[PDB]
Design a protein around this ligand. Structure first.
Ligand SMILES: CCCCCCCCCCCCCCCCCC(=O)OC[C@H](COP(=O)([O-])OCC(O)COP(=O)([O-])OC[C@@H](COC(=O)CCCCCCCCCCCCCCCCC)OC(=O)CCCCCCCCCCCCCCCCC)OC(=O)CCCCCCCCCCCCCCCCC
Ligand SMILES: COC1=C(OC)C(=O)C(C/C=C(\C)CC/C=C(/C)CC/C=C(\C)CC/C=C(\C)CC/C=C(/C)CC/C=C(\C)CC/C=C(\C)CC/C=C(\C)CC/C=C(/C)CCC=C(C)C)=C(C)C1=O
Ligand SMILES: CCCCCCCC/C=C\CCCCCCCC(=O)OC[C@H](COP(=O)(O)OCCN)OC(=O)CCCCCCC/C=C\CCCCCCCC
Ligand SMILES: NC(=O)C1=CN([C@@H]2O[C@H](COP(=O)(O)OP(=O)(O)OC[C@H]3O[C@@H](n4cnc5c(N)ncnc54)[C@H](OP(=O)(O)O)[C@@H]3O)[C@@H](O)[C@H]2O)C=CC1
Ligand SMILES: CN(C)C(=N)NC(=N)N
Ligand code: SF4
Ligand code: SF4
Ligand SMILES: [Zn+2]
Lengths: 48, 125, 96, 112, 208, 376, 176, 97, 115, 341
């Protein structure tokens, strides 16, 4: 997070290079976030 | 002046219905029976015209109930048996008319529950 | 508790499983059958029976407005437990 | 006098009073053909004489507009023309006659 | 005060009733009935052959300057001898009011086109024809407006099924879209929602 | 076609590039909305209006809700009415942004489109926070609104309203005095006041022609009689005058938004009549009458007394009306929908006399046609 | 009240005439437009770095559907068909029967996500908060059939998103 | 926002307005995504006494439309649907643009 | 009503005249329809289809119904002449992708429950 | 029958026809037509494919939801064959190339693959098996294509005695080889013909007729173990046929005799293309060969299909080969070719 950035770019995620059994170094999906971090990232709450 | 047509009215050629659903359909004009689960009689006021039941099968996927009959859900409301009959005749469908069934008047008396010499006396309240 | 049919297909909590000769089993070939492994009947069996010292109990499912509508269960028949049917929860008067 | 009427296609008239008197006189002349007992003739004659009286007693255009309460004087002229055409059509149609035909027994019933 | 009940407007009700009497007196030849609804909406039921005179009067008369044709539609009531009910909604800007004019017709009886009174009547009557089968006599260009080219039947009639009779798909054999009889994977489920208990005593009808 | 809004077939007869006649073919987006409404209940038919003019969603919802409430003889609470007016003006800003920016895009200007669509994204955020859906909210319902505002919505709306006049000024810095824009829009599609009235134009068309008519002023609904705003009036009745009218209507909608924010009252959000509007969740889960009424309202729905009404509002594209006929049951017997774009597109042919292809594009843009509401 | 958008007239004095002539010959308003565009060029863009940055949402957001459970693990749905009755698009199909323990539980609960309009009436009409519209919206599929959900799929969605759904319901249940 | 003064001055000169006074990006000035719990008002018809539904039933006050004239069944002044609309007054705030 | 309002054509003779006029208009148009739409059918096939469509309403004995039918026929023709239609609709007149529906009682009994 | 295999509906798109068909080689001309007919009828169709999934895209709109299932298969993989024929009561074999690639030859595509499909289908209990062969399938034929056709037909009959073996003559249609191959000789100046095409007689058959016959053979109960010959109603000389093709295409016709060995060398030159070859020596042999007459075998009239003459559906294929000058010329504008009956 970086509160100095404008609303929308003040929270971001760096995806992992391997999830479950998939080589996810390049092909990163927007559905890879678990529900709790999904809520925090989409800003439904300010509590991580 | 004004012409005269001494012939029965028929708009089947204009309605656009397929010939199969014009010729092989027998509608049912009737007053719906009162839902036995309720004492309300406000749904038995108007005549209804409904079509005959056709085939329904099970969808291979999701197991839903498929159909091929366009007039399966087509129910019309008519104020009078004559109006419904005229509509069915002018649209060309066959029709079966069922007379309205109204309950016969009944004699009710609260004091009959305590008759001195008749079987109408009740054993409980 | 999932169970396996004689054709090797898992049964859902509703007992659904295609027959051996059913052609519709071909849809799962090269794919998977979506079955939920948690059975509500088994879980609610796992849940215990509460004991309260009153003839009438009130169940709302817990949480207040987050639960089911409040209902009242009559704990008079001692041969069986009183089950709130919204949430399938059993209550019982302390006998003995 | 005024540059524009504020409405597209509505030209300013430099002689409002003369045009209004001419139009109202023509309307009154057309209404003379209508039978006396017709209710269209009485009301239209009344309103026309009421408005024709105002244009002959007020030389100022703005006060005349305030009295007529019919928008600007150009709008009043246009409405007078429409009334004249309507009077001619009504003379042709003759709607003071009794009802053409009663509707069927249940035509305006609702709910049904 | 009653916070949950819409207030009434006796002034507007009386004004509308007076104007309804006015028009009924002016045009006895066509005006069959006049009504004012309790939420202040004036309605006039006229004979079908008086559409042009009534609309021209309500448009050009000084006391009734209904310049704008707000709406024009039809209502299908199969139980009536004349099923189609043509409705005109007019707006008078000078007097800040609205009026409604209702006529009746059936399948085979034309209704005089009112494009000489209001220009919007062109497309409104085209839509009425396309959706109900009502033919307008002197229409400059009367043809389907909303339905598909070559569509059979008038969809908005009460006796026309919801899903129609045909459906479209692309057939690879003929390399074009084709129309085939309708066939639904899941049939529309008809719900009987009316309660058998009377809701409004004020609208009760005589048993007859 | 980029300028045909995707779903309009306009059969044109051209002599060179001069237009001889325009023959708009519509119905490519006809869905049978009125028939489906006849088959649905009153609560189940609200999203149909939500999807009619998909740039003025809460405006369509407000018109339908006003019709149903007039037939029901009930009254929304003042807080509900104020919310309805505030979001109606927000939706008017959305629609005017869309109209002006798409007009400028069809003419050849795109940067205002991008800027004003960032603003539209912010207003979509407002919509989503208040309803859960970014555009198709289904928020305004017969009897009031579905849910109350969150506890930061008013402050965020105030911030957006404060920082929007500069956006409108930046839009005007690019088009208003630009000679190319003036050449494209001035004296194009001129319609006289009498022709507009006869053809049945409403709203921006009439006001551009010079007709002093605005439903929000003449026939107020909700609490539009308690707010102060001005009605822009055109002089030449062309595309340029209509564009200026739309921009000034955006500014006046900002005025109304400010007034609504300052005058937001307390109270409940739906009519306190559980036989029409659903009760709260706690009341449903604790009260027998409330549970019964919730069950009946969400299964059968409220019955509307028999009668027919025509209720119209000043939607951003003109007079949007609904003629609703109820036969005493829980489902509407008839629902005719009068979209302002229908009459305008009907009048498109007359406005394109002696013009060219680019002029026809500009005239379509200034008519601001949405074919969802045109076709229904 | 009303106001005129275009009713002004230019002064015909020599200075104003020369100013207009200079504007005509020297494209002053065109230079103004160029300056505005250059200002926007030097401003900071509003583009977010999707999918690494996600747009803001609210607890009321309507996304993918889910079937919830009580904390005990029992299903919340009681087969009351209120959602099926109120569904505007008729996208919900329900069939029920008495369970082995006599509970009123569904055997078929199908939602057609190609027919649903995501209007949220089902979660309003649910008296037990069983059916919900969760927060997920990234569930696009490569085949049509994958969007025809059934009870197993909806229960899987509920189990997968239960924490976020419960948090959102806790955050927003006082407005309902 | 975060920008150099020189670029800000160039933007101000090119645009002619102080951009930092009114920006188009949101920097911590909006309400926090977490808010205290509310307690909404209850309503006017939530009394425990003198509250009967027959006295506040809006639907049952609806009446069939009054039949002003039905064909089936002095000098009166001509009337109008309503008094003519009064002339709109020019805005005092900004009559002309 | 005994005195029904006539659309036009009064009696059945003028209605037949309008029917013949519309038939001539359709007949002279089939070559143009085949040429412009680039149909793969013969001109004889198009004329036969026009004849069949005319003949399926040969049992009408009401002048008003005949007038409405010829009005709709003129509407259909003006759709074809102005190329408002496509090859899709013109071929929709031919039902080219339907399986031959059985008409005998035994075949109907075999296939399903359809009367 | 299983309760899921009982036909229901009115034979539409959403009906149940009781047919579960595995269509090998569905990613082809006859394959696409057969799959379209099955889906229109309302049957369950399994499409085993080895190509890119992109090239199977046109088969998707051919059936309702869940009726078309795409499963990857390998020709020389009995495991994949069993996987794709496990749950189907009808198996249709349409696999075949007109040329020989590096990995697959005429022996592979016409003997090994059909025999494997027939044998695996028998083990899986498939009720019906339709196998497509060629009419001119001769064991001593000059063409390796036809020799392999005959050997594979014998192998299929040995493996699955209850088969229906169909022998189309020369399928012509939009995506065909025949009419396109004869109409694509414009680019090479004139039209080379062996003996000027005066010694060859051919009766091509319409693709829709072939597909309808294949569908009817499934529904016909007494066609279990039979051999059908699908030929057109008219027999033409090769010269007359090519002349009619060029006349309909509105292209100038300049035929010339080319000796057989020279034509074989020309075909040898064109088959060095790694991609789909324009022509091959086997193709030249088949074109020169006359279509056989097999009166004893049944046909389309026996299956209930009236053969569609070439003169009616020739314009569907050959209108694409015209220019803008003659694009709109009508079907009747060209006289029918001179038949040999
Ligand atoms: C260097 C560029 C970035 C400088 C800033 C920086 O690093 O910030 C960290 C920055 C972090 O961002 P931040 O600080 O959070 O946000 C910025 C602030 O908000 C602050 O944002 P801001 O916008 O306020 O900052 C602007 C500020 C700081 O920014 C700059 O000063 C911009 C860079 C210099 C502009 C002039 C370039 C001239 C030609 C290049 C050689 C000289 C300059 C570089 C070396 C300088 C040595 C002293 O500049 C000024 O205030 C005025 C600068 C002068 C303007 C003059 C008028 C404009 C037109 C200039 C035309 C030049 C000639 C034409 C082009 C010729 C070919 C290149 O991260 C990066 O920059 C990461 C890299 C991003 C991409 C850089 C691409 C450009 C690289 C140079 C050109 C390409 C050469 C290699 C090509 C390889 C191809 C395979
Ligand atoms: C409902 O509907 C909708 C609408 O209403 C219909 C709408 O309005 C809108 C709104 C839409 C908009 C607002 C969009 C419009 C606005 C915009 C800003 C869009 C702007 C668009 C553009 C700018 C498009 C222009 C760009 C294009 C078209 C891309 C073209 C790209 C190219 C690359 C051109 C081709 C160039 C070529 C081929 C050059 C090739 C070079 C060579 C051959 C040279 C070879 C050299 C060598 C080989 C040398 C090699 C040398 C080396 C060193 C390499 C060696 C290394 C090795 C490894 C080998 C939307 C969204 C909508 O939804
Ligand atoms: C003079 C030489 C001209 C050079 C050839 C021009 C190259 C273009 C040819 C071409 O594109 O078509 C090849 C064409 C069709 O393939 P496509 O067009 O890719 O597929 C679309 C089918 N409608 O190939 C063929 O099928 C033609 C078959 C060739 C057989 C005849 C060859 C005889 C050679 C001439 C004999 C002279 C030798 C002495
Ligand atoms: N067409 C004609 O004129 C005649 C054809 N026949 C026969 O009818 C059948 C169908 O012919 P047709 O459709 O025209 O030809 P195609 O070449 O167009 O179709 C052949 C089909 O088989 C597949 N296939 C080819 N080789 C292999 C392989 N090694 N492994 C797996 N699949 C393979 C192809 O798929 P892919 O896309 O992956 O290559 C394609 O689906 C053939 O058996 C042919 O011999 C009989 C008489 C006349
Ligand atoms: C307004 N609508 C719906 C558009 N598609 N607009 C557009 N400019 N493409
Ligand atoms: S969101 Fe609306 S349309 Fe979708 S399933 Fe729920 S009730 Fe039905
Ligand atoms: S409303 Fe809730 S409890 Fe009722 S059937 Fe639907 S999901 Fe189940
Ligand atoms: Zn409980």
């Amino acid at each position: 997070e970086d509160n100095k950035q404008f609303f929308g770019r003040h929270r971001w995620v760096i995806y992992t290079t391997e999830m479950n059994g998939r080589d996810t170094f390049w092909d990163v999906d927007g559905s890879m976030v678990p529900p709790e971090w999904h809520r925090w990232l989409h800003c439904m709450t300010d509590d991580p | 002046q004004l012409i005269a047509v001494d012939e029965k009215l028929d708009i089947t050629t204009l309605t656009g219905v397929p010939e199969e659903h014009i010729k092989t359909r027998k509608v049912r004009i009737f007053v719906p029976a009162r839902n036995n689960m309720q004492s309300g009689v406000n749904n038995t006021k108007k005549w209804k015209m409904e079509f005959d039941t056709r085939e329904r099968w099970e969808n291979p996927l999701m197991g839903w109930s498929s159909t091929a009959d366009p007039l399966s859900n087509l129910v019309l409301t008519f104020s009078t048996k004559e109006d419904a009959v005229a509509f069915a005749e002018k649209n060309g469908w066959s029709f079966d008319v069922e007379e309205r069934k109204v309950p016969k008047p009944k004699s009710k008396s609260y004091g009959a529950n305590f008759s001195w010499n008749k079987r109408t006396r009740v054993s409980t309240k | 508790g999932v169970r396996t049919s004689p054709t090797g297909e898992k049964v859902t909590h509703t007992g659904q499983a295609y027959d051996d000769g059913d052609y519709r089993r071909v849809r799962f070939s090269d794919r998977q059958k979506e079955v939920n492994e948690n059975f509500a009947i088994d879980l609610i069996a796992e849940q215990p029976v509460s004991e309260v010292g009153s003839r009438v109990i009130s169940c709302d499912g817990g949480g207040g407005a987050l639960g089911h509508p409040r209902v009242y269960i009559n704990l008079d028949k001692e041969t069986k437990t009183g089950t709130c049917g919204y949430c399938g929860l059993q209550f019982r008067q302390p006998h003995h | 006098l005024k540059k524009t009427t504020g409405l597209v296609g509505l030209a300013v008239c430099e002689t409002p009073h003369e045009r209004l008197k001419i139009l109202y006189t023509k309307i009154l002349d057309v209404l003379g053909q209508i039978p006396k007992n017709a209710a269209y003739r009485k009301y239209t004659e009344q309103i026309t004489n009421e408005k024709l009286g105002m244009v002959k007693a007020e030389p100022d255009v703005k006060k005349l507009e305030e009295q007529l309460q019919g928008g600007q004087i150009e709008e009043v002229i246009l409405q007078a023309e429409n009334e004249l055409s309507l009077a001619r059509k009504m003379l042709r149609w003759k709607p003071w006659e009794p009802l053409v035909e009663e509707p069927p027994a249940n035509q305006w019933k609702w709910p049904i | 005060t009653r916070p949950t009940i819409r207030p009434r407007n006796d002034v507007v009700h009386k004004q509308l009733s007076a104007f309804g009497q006015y028009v009924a007196e002016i045009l006895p030849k066509y005006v069959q009935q006049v009504q004012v609804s309790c939420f202040n909406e004036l309605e006039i039921f006229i004979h079908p052959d008086g559409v042009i005179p009534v609309l021209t009067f309500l448009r050009d008369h000084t006391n009734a300057q209904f310049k704008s044709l707000a709406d024009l539609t039809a209502v299908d009531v199969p139980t009536r001898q004349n099923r189609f009910e043509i409705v005109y909604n007019l707006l008078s800007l000078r007097f800040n009011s609205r009026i409604r004019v209702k006529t009746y017709t059936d399948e085979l009886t034309p209704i005089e086109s009112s494009v000489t009174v209001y220009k919007a009547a062109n497309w409104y009557e085209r839509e009425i024809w396309d959706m109900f089968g009502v033919f307008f006599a002197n229409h400059p260009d009367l043809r389907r407006i909303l339905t598909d080219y070559g569509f059979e039947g008038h969809p908005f009639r009460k006796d026309f099924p919801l899903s129609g009779y045909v459906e479209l798909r692309y057939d690879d054999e003929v390399k074009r879209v084709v129309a085939e009889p309708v066939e639904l994977a899941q049939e529309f489920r008809k719900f009987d929602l009316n309660s058998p208990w009377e809701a409004f005593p004020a609208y009760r009808q005589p048993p007859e | 076609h980029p300028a045909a809004h995707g779903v309009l077939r306009l059969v044109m007869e051209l002599s060179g590039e001069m237009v001889r006649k325009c023959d708009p073919h519509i119905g490519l987006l006809h869905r049978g909305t009125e028939k489906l409404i006849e088959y649905k209940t009153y609560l189940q038919a609200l999203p149909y209006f939500d999807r009619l003019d998909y740039v003025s969603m809460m405006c369509n919802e407000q018109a339908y809700s006003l019709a149903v409430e007039k037939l029901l003889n009930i009254q929304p609470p003042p807080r509900a009415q104020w919310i309805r007016v505030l979001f109606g003006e927000i939706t008017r800003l959305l629609n005017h942004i869309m109209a002006v920016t798409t007009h400028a895009l069809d003419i050849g200007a795109m940067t205002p489109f991008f800027w004003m669509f960032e603003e539209r994204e912010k207003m979509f955020e407002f919509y989503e926070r208040v309803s859960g859906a970014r555009m198709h909210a289904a928020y305004i319902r017969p009897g009031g609104v579905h849910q109350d505002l969150p506890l930061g919505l008013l402050d965020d709306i105030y911030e957006f309203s404060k920082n929007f006049s500069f956006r409108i000024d930046e839009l005007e810095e690019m088009l208003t005095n630009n000679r190319i824009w003036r050449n494209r829009t001035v004296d194009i599609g001129v319609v006289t006041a009498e022709d507009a009235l006869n053809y049945g134009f409403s709203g921006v068309m009439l006001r551009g022609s010079g007709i002093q008519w605005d439903l929000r002023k003449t026939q107020p609904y909700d609490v539009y009689d308690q707010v102060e705003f001005d009605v822009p009036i055109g002089s030449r009745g062309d595309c340029y005058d209509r564009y200026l009218c739309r921009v000034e209507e955006m500014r006046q909608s900002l005025r109304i938004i400010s007034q609504c924010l300052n005058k937001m009252p307390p109270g409940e959000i739906k009519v306190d009549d559980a036989k029409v509007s659903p009760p709260k969740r706690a009341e449903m889960k604790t009260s027998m009458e409330s549970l019964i009424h919730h069950f009946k309202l969400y299964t059968e729905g409220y019955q509307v007394p028999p009668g027919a009404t025509y209720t119209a509002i000043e939607a951003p594209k003109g007079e949007f009306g609904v003629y609703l006929v109820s036969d005493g049951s829980s489902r509407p017997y008839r629902c005719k929908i009068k979209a302002p774009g229908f009459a305008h597109l009907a009048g498109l042919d007359k406005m394109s006399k002696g013009h060219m292809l680019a002029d026809v594009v500009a005239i379509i843009g200034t008519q601001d046609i949405v074919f969802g509401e045109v076709d229904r | 009240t009303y106001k005129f958008v275009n009713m002004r007239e230019p002064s015909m004095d020599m200075k104003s005439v020369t100013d207009r002539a200079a504007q005509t010959l020297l494209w002053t308003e065109l230079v103004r437009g160029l300056g505005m565009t250059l200002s926007y060029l030097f401003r900071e863009p509003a583009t977010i770095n999707y999918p690494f940055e996600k747009g803001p949402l609210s607890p009321r957001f309507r996304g993918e559907h889910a079937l919830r459970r009580y904390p005990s693990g029992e299903e919340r749905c009681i087969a009351c068909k209120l959602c099926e009755a109120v569904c505007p698009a008729q996208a919900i199909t329900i069939e029920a029967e008495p369970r082995a323990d006599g509970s009123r539980r569904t055997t078929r609960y199908d939602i057609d996500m190609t027919k649903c309009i995501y209007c949220g009436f089902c979660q309003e009409a649910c008296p037990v908060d069983a059916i919900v519209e969760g927060p997920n919206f990234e569930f696009s599929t490569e085949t049509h059939e994958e969007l025809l959900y059934n009870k197993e799929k909806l229960l899987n969605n509920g189990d997968k998103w239960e924490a976020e759904i419960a948090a959102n319901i806790q955050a927003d249940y006082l407005y309902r | 926002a975060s920008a150099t003064r020189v670029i800000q001055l160039l933007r101000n000169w090119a645009s002619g307005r102080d951009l930092q006074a009114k920006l188009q990006l949101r920097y911590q000035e909006i309400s926090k995504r977490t808010q205290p719990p509310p307690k909404l008002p209850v309503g006017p018809s939530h009394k425990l006494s003198n509250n009967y539904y027959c006295t506040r039933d809006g639907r049952r006050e609806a009446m069939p439309p009054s039949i002003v004239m039905s064909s089936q069944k002095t000098e009166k002044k001509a009337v109008t649907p309503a008094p003519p609309i009064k002339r709109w007054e020019l805005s005092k705030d900004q009559p002309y643009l | 009503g005994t005195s029904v309002k006539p659309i036009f054509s009064r009696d059945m003779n003028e209605a037949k005249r309008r029917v013949r006029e519309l038939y001539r208009a359709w007949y002279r148009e089939v070559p143009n329809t085949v040429h412009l739409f680039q149909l793969d059918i013969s001109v004889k096939q198009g004329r036969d289809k026009v004849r069949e469509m005319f003949m399926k309403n040969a049992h009408v004995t009401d002048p008003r119904v005949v007038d409405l039918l010829v009005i709709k026929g003129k509407m259909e023709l003006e759709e074809t002449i102005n190329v408002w239609k496509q090859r899709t609709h013109i071929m929709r007149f031919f039902h080219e992708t339907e399986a031959p529906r059985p008409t005998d009682f035994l075949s109907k009994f075999y296939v399903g429950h359809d009367p | 029958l299983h309760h899921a295999l009982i036909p229901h509906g009115k034979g539409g798109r959403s009906s149940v026809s009781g047919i579960v068909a595995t269509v090998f080689g569905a990613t082809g001309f006859l394959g696409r037509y057969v799959v379209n007919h099955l889906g229109r009828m309302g049957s369950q169709v399994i499409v085993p494919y080895r190509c890119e999934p992109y090239d199977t895209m046109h088969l998707r709109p051919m059936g309702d939801l869940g009726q078309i299932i795409f499963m990857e298969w390998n020709g020389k993989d009995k495991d994949s064959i069993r996987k794709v024929v496990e749950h189907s009561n009808v198996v249709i074999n349409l696999v075949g190339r007109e040329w020989e690639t590096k990995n697959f030859d005429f022996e592979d595509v016409f003997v090994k693959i059909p025999h494997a499909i027939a044998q695996v289908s028998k083990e899986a209990g498939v009720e019906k098996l339709i196998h497509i062969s060629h009419l001119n399938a001769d064991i001593k034929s000059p063409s390796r294509y036809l020799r392999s056709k005959a050997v594979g037909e014998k192998e299929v009959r040995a493996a699955f005695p209850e088969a229906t073996i169909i022998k189309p003559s020369d399928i012509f249609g939009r995506e065909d080889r025949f009419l396109n191959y004869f109409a694509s000789m414009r680019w090479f100046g004139g039209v080379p013909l062996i003996s000027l095409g005066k010694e060859t007689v051919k009766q091509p058959v319409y693709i829709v007729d072939v597909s309808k016959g294949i569908i009817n053979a499934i529904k016909d109960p007494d066609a279990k173990g039979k051999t059908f010959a699908f030929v057109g109603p008219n027999r033409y000389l090769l010269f007359d046929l090519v002349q009619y093709i060029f006349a309909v295409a509105y292209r100038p016709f300049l035929p010339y005799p080319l000796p057989h060995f020279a034509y074989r060398w020309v075909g040898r030159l064109f088959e060095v293309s790694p991609f789909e070859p324009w022509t091959t020596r086997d193709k030249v042999e088949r074109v020169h060969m006359s279509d056989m007459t097999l009166p004893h075998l049944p046909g389309l009239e026996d299956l209930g299909i009236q053969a569609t003459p070439l003169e009616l559906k020739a314009i569907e294929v050959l209108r694409r080969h015209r220019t803008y000058r003659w694009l709109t010329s009508e079907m009747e504008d060209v006289k029918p070719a001179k038949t040999v009956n």
